[PDB]
Design an enzyme around this catalytic site. Structure first.
Site, PDB file in Angstrom:
ATOM      1  N   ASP A  35      27.189 -48.815 -44.182  1.00  0.00           N
ATOM      2  CA  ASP A  35      26.778 -49.181 -45.816  1.00  0.00           C
ATOM      3  C   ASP A  35      25.187 -49.610 -45.523  1.00  0.00           C
ATOM      4  O   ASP A  35      25.028 -50.773 -45.169  1.00  0.00           O
ATOM      5  CB  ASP A  35      27.759 -50.078 -46.331  1.00  0.00           C
ATOM      6  CG  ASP A  35      27.156 -50.307 -47.688  1.00  0.00           C
ATOM      7  OD1 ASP A  35      26.219 -49.830 -48.169  1.00  0.00           O
ATOM      8  OD2 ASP A  35      27.585 -51.460 -48.227  1.00  0.00           O
ATOM      9  N   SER A 199      10.250 -42.664 -54.625  1.00  0.00           N
ATOM     10  CA  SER A 199      10.228 -41.265 -54.733  1.00  0.00           C
ATOM     11  C   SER A 199       9.095 -40.789 -55.652  1.00  0.00           C
ATOM     12  O   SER A 199       8.883 -41.639 -56.598  1.00  0.00           O
ATOM     13  CB  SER A 199      11.830 -40.616 -55.347  1.00  0.00           C
ATOM     14  OG  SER A 199      11.666 -39.191 -55.518  1.00  0.00           O
TER      15      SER A 199
END
Ligand code: D8J
Ligand code: D8J
Length: 330
Positions: A35, A199
């Site tokens: 994770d 992004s």
């Protein structure tokens, strides 16, 4: 040193991925959920409340000659989905794909919430976010990666998740045969303890690319892609019959639909998520309404590039003095 381990979807939908991890002496192999959005290595154990264990493999520290109780240490974590676990702490030898860390904090669960109990395939979590998020008290502990880092050939690990198929976690090296083209690296902020990056934008299907900064985290421990409501609305508007259902808890779409791809930007590079990666199947058995793999982050507080996004890429988690993230097509 290096390590290399195969990671395997827990079910036919890729809800999560499990990776075998050796703990203790003699080894006890548990299948853990790696994770990159949390920083605790915790396991089902001989100490876990009996009624809360249902099929998981447990760690039994009394059977490990290298286990030592970390005196006075406790841990307690609550995840973004409302799940939780807590317990005490041992140090022990932990190996992943041939890479060994001695004195790793292994957090033994005394309590786990129902969603963990109900997932028989996940024996615990191995956190790979930054150690500043580790919940052990009163002495915060380091992640497996943090502990291994100085010994690694290169201070990196990579995630190569498969679509409805196994994939690979590598530690300490970049497998140049595992991706196409080049790896594009992008800056990381560690201020919130995550692999947080920005992004450069998105496209829906064959549509034009929208340049827009989207701050989010690279999170292998989250199933779906959570993005701003504007972006998500633009995606589902291209699927006839798709709608946001408050009763179901997100966007659903007719199972008869053909889903468009979704592209996200990494610098000037582009990662294309195929449409079928975004299909998470009937909302309930036999339903013709299917659950979408791109969902709004509006009620979360952060955008999450979860498995839906990451499995479309070869992803480098670069733990150099100034960490960065790398993405390649594959
Ligand atoms: N099937 C749907 C698609 O993704 C949604 C959210 N993901 C989980 O609920 C989940 C995450 C990790 C895990 F180990 C097991 C389940 C789910 O409702
Ligand atoms: N863990 C998850 O990925 C998750 C599980 C349940 C949920 F409702 C949302 C996300």
């Amino acid at each position: 040193s290096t390590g290399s381990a195969t990671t395997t979807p827990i079910d036919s939908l890729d809800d999560a991925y499990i990776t075998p991890v050796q703990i203790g002496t003699p080894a006890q192999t548990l299948n853990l959920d790696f994770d990159t959005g949390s920083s605790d290595l915790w396991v089902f154990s001989s100490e876990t409340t009996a009624s809360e264990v249902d099929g998981q493999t447990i760690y039994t520290p009394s059977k490990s000659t290298t286990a030592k109780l970390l005196s006075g240490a406790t841990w307690s974590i609550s995840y973004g989905d409302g799940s939780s676990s807590s317990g005490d702490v041992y140090t022990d030898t932990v190996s992943v794909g041939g890479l060994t860390v001695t004195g790793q904090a292994v957090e033994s669960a005394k309590k786990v919430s129902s969603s963990f109990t109900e997932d028989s395939t996940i024996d615990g979590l191995l956190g790979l976010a930054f150690s500043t998020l580790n919940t052990v008290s009163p002495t915060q502990q380091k992640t497996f990666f943090d502990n291994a880092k100085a010994s690694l050939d290169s201070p990196v690990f990579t995630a190569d998740l498969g679509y409805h198929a196994p994939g690979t976690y590598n530690f300490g090296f970049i497998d140049t045969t595992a991706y196409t083209g080049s790896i594009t690296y992008t800056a990381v902020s560690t201020k919130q303890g995550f692999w947080e990056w920005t992004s450069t934008g998105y496209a829906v299907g064959s549509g034009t690319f929208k340049s827009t900064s989207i701050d989010g985290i690279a999170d292998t421990g989250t199933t779906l892609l959570y993005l701003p409501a504007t972006v998500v609305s633009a995606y589902w508007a291209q699927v006839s019959g798709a709608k946001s259902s408050s009763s179901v808890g997100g966007y659903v779409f007719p199972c008869s639909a053909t889903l468009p791809s979704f592209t996200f930007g990494v610098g000037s590079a582009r990662i294309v998520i195929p449409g079928d990666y975004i299909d998470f199947g009937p909302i309930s058995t036999g339903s013709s309404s299917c659950f979408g793999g791109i969902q709004s982050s509006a009620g979360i507080g952060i955008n999450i590039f979860g498995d839906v996004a990451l499995k479309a890429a070869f992803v480098v988690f670069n733990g150099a003095t100034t960490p960065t993230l790398g993405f390649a097509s594959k």
